[model samples]
Target: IVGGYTCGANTVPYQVSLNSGYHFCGGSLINSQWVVSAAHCYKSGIQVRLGEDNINVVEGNEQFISASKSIVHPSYNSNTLNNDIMLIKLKSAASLNSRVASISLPTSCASAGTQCLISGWGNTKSSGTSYPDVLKCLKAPILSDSSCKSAYPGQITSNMFCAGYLEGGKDSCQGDSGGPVVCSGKLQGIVSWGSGCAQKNKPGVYTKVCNYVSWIKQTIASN
Candidate 1:
């Protein structure tokens, strides 16, 4: 989203706009009734909007649903951003159609050098508050685990991963948090944090989805 250009409507059908009074974070629809996002993106007034690209206009396929329950990973570390993922159970299921669908989760971790897409309505400028009227998407390369570790030293853990251009200029930024990082047609990561938008050597950090498959399955089953 950050440092990216506009994307086509319905290109990312699983994308969800997390709204708390207003649009704040991005997320993905994992199923008809369950949405996945970042734990830190949770708020009291949060809701999910689906089937549309532009947030400024109301489309016929759009569905605005309330959150029935929000389950934040119990072990999520706000400071280190470990286990930053979360699940929001919708009060009603989304109607599946061309404009709305769910994305499949990755069965394995993304390999280094893999390129993925991240989309959102987040700010384009690194230090600006203004956001795009329509959704934006960009392709970012997955950094090697060792390289990611070296970028942040001890901050990189098994639960986390990095994606973006090492040379800087393209990455997820503010308001893109909790957005899906889709690699080769599978959901691989969740936008978590970064030093700043598109910073050199400091690629965007994401919650490694492959590392929490069991946890996600268990949580969904129980709740």
Candidate 2:
């Protein structure tokens, strides 16, 4: 069952390697050509797995396609966590039918309380073992601007957003970083950071998907 706060991943989970292992957070299919995610996840040499549920995507039993070039957020800075998002230019288009499909990006900021979906293959229970090859999903709600601001204090920049279980214990964790926080079926946020896993006061902070629409378009255009 899907949890409420603090979170979940695809198949590889953090640094753990799977059959089609690629250190990716999450990605959206844009115009049948490119996929977008976090720069940290898109670092060179890291592969991207798409359209697969279990980790055995490489076994040819599930529908999965790998990616080629990785276009990380141009302004990404590991130290600063500045614009940690990125995009993947697929070698070719994906098949129309795949259980583990790509999502779409949002054009504007999602309203507070908006129910969103998050996916990952990372840690499930706080600091627990990784999922290895199995991908999982969870539902998260968009938090009000004021509440989010109050929770995160000064770090709640216009480019960032907040979500998770107010009651705690069901949100994203370490390896789940850079995954997608979906809303209205549109990719709305990138799992970025928070204090600890499923803490009472800390909410899951994400890279606002809408804030970088222009950046996304431009970056994908050139790549």
Candidate 3:
């Protein structure tokens, strides 16, 4: 996270890392067997590392599982970044514990001005490649759609939502994509796209998970 501090070691048990050889994207465990993340982060041979705090250390609490299925939203658009959501079915169910657990999905959309927490193992700086070893978090409020559109004209959509400071002090940076933006103890958003790491008039854009809660359940049930 661009301007957040290292979150408590076990506070974000739902947070995860998408990896090939190293952390490239962030994710949130929504259930014992399912993970919610960004569509653009998908790739073959990617592994999900759950219960991670620091990627550089050997945290025995971590669970490295392969994805059995990587399902991207049918309406996901790379150019527009709408419906930029994805789900991963793990090969095996993750063992739930104080340091590894699933977060609840939102039942409704978050209101404007509601405070939310964004967490990830992403670059701490706006530029360059200085990623944090430990998980970082930023507390920001959800911005209204009008303000979001004002920040990035012709970009915001109903499936997308905005969060973070308009003045650009904090945000979800690269490698934080597909991570959690929790509000009201529900998994509200996933870091999807943004104009910059953290910039004036530009805020972090995310997939509004409430819009896909039905899709998530139905898809899982059908499978």
Give the number of the best model, judged by lDDT: 3
Measured on C-alpha atoms, candidate 1 has an lDDT of 0.89
Quick one: ranking by TM-score, best first? 3, 1, 2
Judged by TM-score, which candidate is best?
Answer: 3
lDDT (C-alpha, whole model) for all candidates: 0.89, 0.64, 0.92
- Better-scoring candidate (TM-score), 1 or 2: 1
lDDT of 1 by residue, 1-223 (tens): 6678788888899999998878989999998999899999978767899987889898777999999999999999988888998999999999988899999988878899999999998878766667788989999888998889988898998888899988888889898899999999999999999898888888999999998888888988888
Model 2: per-residue lDDT, tens digit, 1-223? 1243322233222212212344445555555556666666645554555554555545453433456777677677776566878777666765544334456667768999998777665666665555545666677788887888899777777777788876787777766776677788777888787777777878888888888888877877777
Off by over 4 Å in 3: none
Residue 55 in candidate 2 has what lDDT? 51
- lDDT value, candidate 2, whole model: 0.64
**Candidate 2 wrong stretches, greater than 4 Å:** 1-24, 57-66, 98-101, 130-132
Per-candidate alpha-carbon RMSD to the true structure: 1.1, 4.4, 0.8
